[PDB]
């Protein structure tokens, strides 16, 4: 009986040309955004009262300096790579890095880099590895990156040491919000005849089950995407049809917050 809340650190670096660049970042713990990192800011910004976890102020300031130096150095290194490898602007680079702490204290991590929306390389163990079937210039990038023994040591420290300890503190500091349960409210509506539509909004966390008569569920239900609300809740629309059969159909909603008391809405 346990759920996983991985820490995903996302970086969005855009290079319009050699003189216009910006880097923005975010941190997700499970489905909750815990940090925000704007290009016009000197520091990573905490979005939750518990976003610092159990790190001390000095420990957190150390990470601030590491990320501050990393952002400027990453920007400079990309511009040199584009000149070194003769890659034409614009350049779009994304980083997805983090770790997860499994119940029982096991840990594992990841560090994936994308170029123009495609994986090109990742950090595996102590070195950088190219993505399978990657462009030829990535081999030169890997060749240059693995010569940097200080960066390789720092990345390994962050993934294998800093991140698991950070997550462990966050799981305890934000335990109330991470395990919170918010009950959804539902309502029915009409749609263009090909169509019964069942709305479900306001639930937290994200996992939900919605399907359309008594004990028989019409397997032709069309579930939509789980869409976000501004208050960190979620919204889902489910649609369904022969005109005569619609009489007597019902929408059933299963969610963890309901404690077994399913929401049942009958049409009419």
């Amino acid at each position: 009986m346990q759920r996983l809340f991985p820490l995903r650190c996302l970086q969005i670096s855009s290079f319009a040309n050699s003189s216009w660049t910006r880097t923005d970042g975010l941190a997700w713990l499970g489905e909750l955004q815990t940090h925000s990192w704007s290009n016009d800011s000197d520091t990573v910004r905490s979005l939750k009262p518990w976003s610092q976890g159990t790190f001390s102020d000095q420990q957190w300031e150390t990470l601030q300096h590491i990320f501050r130096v990393y952002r400027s150095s990453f920007t400079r290194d990309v511009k040199e790579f584009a000149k070194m490898l003769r890659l034409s602007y614009p350049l779009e680079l994304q980083v997805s890095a983090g770790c997860e702490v499994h119940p029982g204290n096991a840990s594992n991590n990841f560090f994936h880099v994308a170029f123009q929306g495609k994986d090109i390389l990742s950090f595996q163990g102590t070195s950088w590895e190219p993505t399978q079937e990657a462009p030829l210039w990535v081999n030169l990038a890997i060749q240059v990156l693995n010569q940097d023994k200080w960066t390789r040591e720092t990345v390994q420290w962050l993934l294998n040491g800093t991140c698991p300890q950070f997550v462990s503190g966050l799981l305890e500091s934000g335990k109330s919000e991470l395990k919170k349960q918010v009950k959804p409210k539902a309502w029915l509506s009409r749609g263009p005849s090909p169509l019964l539509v069942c709305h479900v909004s306001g639930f937290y966390p994200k996992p939900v089950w919605v399907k359309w008569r008594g004990e028989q569920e019409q397997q032709g239900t069309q579930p939509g995407d789980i869409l976000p609300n501004a208050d960190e809740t979620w919204y889902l629309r489910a649609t369904l049809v022969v005109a005569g059969e619609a009489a007597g159909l019902s929408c059933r909603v299963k969610h963890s917050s309901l404690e077994g008391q399913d929401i049942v809405l009958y049409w009419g």
Partner: nanobody
Amino acid sequence: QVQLVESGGGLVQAGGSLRLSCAASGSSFSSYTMTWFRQAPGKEREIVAGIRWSGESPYYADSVKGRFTISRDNAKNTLYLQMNSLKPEDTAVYYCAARLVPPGIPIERTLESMRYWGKGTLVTVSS
């Protein structure tokens, strides 16, 4: 990023005391793991002490426990080594070293990862 300059070395008699200092030039000195190394005549360079953030127990080599104390003044960007009960085997060139280490790493696993080094200061223990 960090430049280190040791000072305070000199001649001292056995059983006496001497204070070494290390002036660091850089941006975020308080974030750096600071260490003292020494190389005795005819012997290999070895770690003496290490210090990081407030509240953490500093590292000490077994040969200097109870005699040497490492400390730092982050407001002055200065690292200190207070050497008491000096022995003739403490004669060495003492080196200041630094490395930016993120949280979650035990200090004893970073003693071989120093990046920036000073040029050393000589301490001679007579008698």
